[PDB]
Design a protein around this ligand. Structure first.
Ligand SMILES: [Cl-]
Length: 162
């Protein structure tokens, strides 16, 4: 198991615009198109991202290109961020994958504000960190996924995905 397989399990593959937990317009393997309620606004973003008139439908390779870009942008965002980097440096390989997962899903900024959990992860307090992560809009809104990501931080194995 590796970060790409993990994310492909968490987000799934959809070749048509759809809405995420949060009613936000998405495509492919979790690619966020926009927060506007406008679908026309989404389709516009999509064509821009793809480079062609897509009419809201993409191919599987197109989805894969977007996913590769997004995982790359998440990792780089962690490494540049003052609050996220030291946490990442302190973690083992499985836990690192889980932090990449969070950033991909909610962005740099959003993960950066989970101040208390980040400190607990840094300090290797796994059980407390799992309890704290569960008290968030994130988990209440989208519980299944949150669950897997949280277990992953809890045990340091790929069991929730196996
Ligand atoms: Cl809560």
């Amino acid at each position: 198991m590796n970060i790409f397989e993990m994310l492909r399990i968490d987000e799934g593959l959809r070749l048509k615009i759809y809405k995420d937990c949060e009613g936000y317009y998405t495509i492919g393997i979790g690619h966020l198109l926009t927060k506007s309620p406008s679908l026309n606004a989404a389709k516009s973003e999509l064509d821009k991202a793809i480079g062609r008139n897509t009419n809201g439908v993409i191919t599987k390779d197109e989805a894969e290109k977007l996913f590769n870009q997004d995982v790359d942008a998440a990792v780089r965002g962690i490494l540049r961020n003052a609050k996220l980097k030291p946490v990442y440096d302190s973690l083992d390989a499985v836990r690192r994958a889980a932090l990449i997962n969070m950033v991909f899903q909610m962005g740099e900024t959003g993960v950066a504000g989970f101040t208390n959990s980040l400190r607990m992860l840094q300090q290797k307090r796994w059980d407390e960190a799992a309890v704290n992560l569960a008290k968030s809009r994130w988990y209440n809104q989208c519980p299944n996924r949150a669950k897997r990501v949280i277990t992953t931080f809890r045990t340091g194995t790929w069991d929730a995905y196996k």
